[PDB]
Amino acid sequence: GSIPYLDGTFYLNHTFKKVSIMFDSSVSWPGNDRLLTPNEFEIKRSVDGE
């Protein structure tokens, strides 16, 4: 069947939750306080969100 790797037919990017970036274990790259969540990127906050 179709190979998402090399023809651009991705369909599983809806199963990510949180992406965390750290430069040599320093403060996270996304910035100082650029995000509503304190120190990471939040996706698919599905379980519960106030």
Next chain:
Amino acid sequence: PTHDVTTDRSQRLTLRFVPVDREATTYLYKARFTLAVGDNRVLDMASTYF
């Protein structure tokens, strides 16, 4: 551009504001907030939403 486009200090990008006072009539809801545009930053009113 690199020189003077965006800050390097700590700043949020999205701010939530809880109502200072609220009035729930039988057919109304009167919520009153206090926008706080701190110094050295400008807010475009099109971004705000309830």
Next chain:
Amino acid sequence: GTSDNSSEINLVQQSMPNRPNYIGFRDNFVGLMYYNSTGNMGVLAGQASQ
């Protein structure tokens, strides 16, 4: 026997006391207020900047 209606056999009846069971709050009230849970955290934001 099996039935509990009064009878000569049912006169023989030995009953140990119920097993003791204490109920009360936990120490230092643990578990009474949500802690270190991302679902419902709790805040101490300043009024102005929120």
